[PDB]
Amino acid sequence: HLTPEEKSAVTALWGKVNVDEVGGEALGRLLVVYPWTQRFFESFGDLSTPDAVMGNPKVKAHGKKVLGAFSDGLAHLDNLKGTFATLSELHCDKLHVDPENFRLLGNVLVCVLAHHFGKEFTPPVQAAYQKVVAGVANALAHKYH
Amino acid sequence: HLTPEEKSAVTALWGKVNVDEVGGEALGRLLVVYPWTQRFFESFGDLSTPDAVMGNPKVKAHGKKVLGAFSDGLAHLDNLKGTFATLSELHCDKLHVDPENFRLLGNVLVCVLAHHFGKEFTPPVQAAYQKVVAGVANALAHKYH
Amino acid sequence: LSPADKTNVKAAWGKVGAHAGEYGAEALERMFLSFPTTKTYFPHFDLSHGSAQVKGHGKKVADALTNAVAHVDDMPNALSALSDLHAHKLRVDPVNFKLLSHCLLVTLAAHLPAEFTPAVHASLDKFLASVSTVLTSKY
Amino acid sequence: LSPADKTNVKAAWGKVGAHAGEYGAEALERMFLSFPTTKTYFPHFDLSHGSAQVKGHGKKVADALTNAVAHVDDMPNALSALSDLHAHKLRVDPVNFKLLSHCLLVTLAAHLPAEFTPAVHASLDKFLASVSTVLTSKY
Ligand code: HEM
Numbered sequence: 128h129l130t131p132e133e134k135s136a137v138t139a140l141w142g143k144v145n146v147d148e149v150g151g152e153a154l155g156r157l158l159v160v161y162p163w164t165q166r167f168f169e170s171f172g173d174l175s176t177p178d179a180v181m182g183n184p185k186v187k188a189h190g191k192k193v194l195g196a197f198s199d200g201l202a203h204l205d206n207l208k209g210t211f212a213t214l215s216e217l218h219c220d221k222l223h224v225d226p227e228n229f230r231l232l233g234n235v236l237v238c239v240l241a242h243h244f245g246k247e248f249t250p251p252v253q254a255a256y257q258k259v260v261a262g263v264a265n266a267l268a269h270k271y272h
Numbered sequence: 273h274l275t276p277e278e279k280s281a282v283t284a285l286w287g288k289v290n291v292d293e294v295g296g297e298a299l300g301r302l303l304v305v306y307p308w309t310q311r312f313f314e315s316f317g318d319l320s321t322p323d324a325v326m327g328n329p330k331v332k333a334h335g336k337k338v339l340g341a342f343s344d345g346l347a348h349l350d351n352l353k354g355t356f357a358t359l360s361e362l363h364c365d366k367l368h369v370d371p372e373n374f375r376l377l378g379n380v381l382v383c384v385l386a387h388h389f390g391k392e393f394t395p396p397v398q399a400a401y402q403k404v405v406a407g408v409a410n411a412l413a414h415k416y417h
Numbered sequence: 418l419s420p421a422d423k424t425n426v427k428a429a430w431g432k433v434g435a436h437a438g439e440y441g442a443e444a445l446e447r448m449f450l451s452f453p454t455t456k457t458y459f460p461h462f463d464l465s466h467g468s469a470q471v472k473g474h475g476k477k478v479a480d481a482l483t484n485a486v487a488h489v490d491d492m493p494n495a496l497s498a499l500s501d502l503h504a505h506k507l508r509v510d511p512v513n514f515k516l517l518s519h520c521l522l523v524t525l526a527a528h529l530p531a532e533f534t535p536a537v538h539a540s541l542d543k544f545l546a547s548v549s550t551v552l553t554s555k556y
Numbered sequence: 557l558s559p560a561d562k563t564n565v566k567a568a569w570g571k572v573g574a575h576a577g578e579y580g581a582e583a584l585e586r587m588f589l590s591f592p593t594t595k596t597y598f599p600h601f602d603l604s605h606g607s608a609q610v611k612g613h614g615k616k617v618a619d620a621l622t623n624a625v626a627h628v629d630d631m632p633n634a635l636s637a638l639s640d641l642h643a644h645k646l647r648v649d650p651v652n653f654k655l656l657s658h659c660l661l662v663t664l665a666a667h668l669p670a671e672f673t674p675a676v677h678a679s680l681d682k683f684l685a686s687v688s689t690v691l692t693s694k695y
């Protein structure tokens with residue numbers, strides 16, 4: 128449900144996103160701010176301190192994978208439901224992740240983008256990205272529907 | 273999805289349900305338990321006390337309409353998305369009702385059915401009706417998707 | 418939580434009586450049947466119908482709720498160990514507390530038809546909501 | 557909350573400084589753009605960009621948040637009048653409070669990049685959620 132202007136703004140801002148650290152930051156901040164989500168990552172090592180979470184190589188690598196999935200969803204904005212079918216089955220039929228955590232992660236990603244880009248992250252850019260992350264969460268929660 | 277046994281149980285419990293009092297009780301109980309939902313029914317008159325809510329003819333008739341919509345959805349369990357398209361447009365574009373209130377009302381209806389049917393409202397029957405009301409809420413919130 | 422709400426909850430839970438453990442077991446069974454994703458928090462449990470482990474856990478939950486009714490004005494202090502357990506050791510998603518509250522309300526409605534007036538329904542709903550916030554307050 | 561949370565929130569809001577009204581107006585504009593269903597609560601408002609009405613409302617919200625920061629240990633008493641207005645007269649759906657809290661956090665992240673560490677982020681999330689619970693405790 129993105130206008131061409133919204134799609135262009137989203138693409139332009141995503142072009143400057145560091146794909147090596149943004150996903151790790153988003154996932155680590157999710158773990159710190161919503162600590163019940165740490166239940167799903169018990170094999171990631173020590174997550175007791177925010178510094179330990181943000182310094183965790185496994186958290187960084189998984190954030191890289193999640194950011195790659197987000198970029199894949201951004202490349203196909205008109206087929207999010209079909210892009211995230213396998214990931215939806217993995218998250219729902221195997222991990223039992225509540226779909227509200229998808230929205231939580233999307234909002235954490237929006238906060239990380241704001242923290243990185245500052246005044247470049249204008250309210251219209253944020254609105255376009257909110258549409259994007261809401262669509263991604265809805266597509267990822269399709270098995271629950 | 274509902275198995276044939278769950279569908280049979282749901283239909284059997286539905287025939288017993290009164291079509292003139294259950295929906296009004298569910299709408300009234302929603303208005304009492306979640307009083308921010310009264311913001312959508314300002315033209316319904318006095319709603320200050322629970323007795324005033326449950327004695328409201330407008331609340332009774334509107335609950336009758338909602339129960340009829342639920343019955344229509346039950347007769348078309350495999351086409352919930354197409355059954356509630358016009359109602360979804362009415363609730364989202366015209367009234368801006370948050371989709372959380374749909375699940376709230378479905379849960380209040382489940383509580384009303386339990387209160388009316390007692391020991392006959394077994395946990396399997398409740399699970400089938402939870403699937404039914406979740407499907408109805410998802411169909412009514414589809415226009416936000 | 419208003420004093421009328423406290424009176425309503427106290428009357429309803431007193432009328433529940435000695436069936437508290439049975440009601441807790443039924444609420445847990447309803448939660449497991451309606452929302453099977455909540456079953457993952459009990460991996461070592463035998464979660465079949467009539468299970469002794471489910472019966473004992475339902476008794477424990479019912480005694481906790483009876484204590485909370487006895488301590489409405491002191492819920493954070495009365496439920497401190499339970500809140501620590503649920504928030505730190507178990508890391509229960511806060512949505513499952515809503516699910517269990519709904520199943521408890523359904524059990525109460527099904528077993529106490531006369532007591533489940535709309536006012537009692539609202540009072541019990543907000544009592545269970547407050548119990549859930551206390552149990553999730555250590556996040 | 558926590559003493560460390562209180563210190564983090566106090567530091568972040570103090571370094572917000574005299575721009576708090578601008579921050580609140582920007583957060584309200586972000587909420588109106590991202591979640592247009594929130595605009596139904598302001599039907600007699602001019603909700604265009606650069607609107608003086610939104611500027612004044614953002615200033616009011618920012619002053620309320622500054623008062624809440626100053627009275628972190630007595631927030632329910634400091635925010636009693638506001639909680640009555642939000643729940644009885646306005647009847648704001650409690651999801652909108654989460655929406656406004658998210659937009660406030662986004663404004664803070666965009667304007668204080670150096671201070672938006674994960675720990676400060678968690679502290680601010682806890683603070684804003686506590687303000688939202690205080691404002692939604694009078695239904
Ligand atoms: C909201 C958007 C999300 C996206 C796009 C996403 C994406 C991904 C990706 C790409 C993988 C890699 C799977 C593989 O390598 O085979 C994965 C796995 C995983 N995700 Fe997510 N994720 C999201 C949200 C979440 C949330 C919120 C949680 C937990 C609270 C979560 C928990 C997990 C876990 C535990 C795995 C490991 C499972 C496995 O690899 O077998 N995910 N996700």
Ligand code: HEM
Pocket residue numbers: 309312313337338341342359362363367369373374375377378408409412
């Ligand atoms: C969850 C299942 C629901 C169903 C099946 C349902 C069904 C209906 C029906 C059949 C109508 C009548 C429309 C007409 O006469 O043209 C209606 C109207 C309305 N509904 Fe719902 N409803 C649901 C939930 C809700 C909730 C939770 C709210 C508010 C919190 C709400 C607010 C309204 C309002 C304000 C109207 C008046 C609009 C009109 O009469 O045209 N509905 N709904």
Ligand code: HEM
Pocket residue numbers: 455458459477478479481482499503507509513514515517548549552
């Ligand atoms: C009103 C809500 C709740 C109450 C009063 C409650 C109460 C209790 C009590 C009394 C115990 C045992 C404590 C002990 O043995 O020392 C317990 C343990 C436990 N609770 Fe809850 N609880 C509630 C909600 C939940 C929910 C919603 C879940 C999960 C969806 C949950 C999962 C557990 C688990 C996994 C245990 C550990 C039991 C075991 O491993 O043997 N609780 N709870």
Ligand code: HEM
Pocket residue numbers: 594597598616617620621638641642646648652653656687688691
């Ligand atoms: C942290 C959250 C919030 C704070 C601190 C806050 C604060 C305030 C303040 C200080 C006022 C002015 C009261 C007065 O002038 O006497 C107000 C009014 C109002 N608020 Fe909020 N508010 C919050 C959340 C919300 C949300 C989420 C909504 C709607 C989505 C909302 C809708 C309104 C409305 C409609 C008014 C009336 C304004 C007018 O009539 O001029 N508030 N709020």
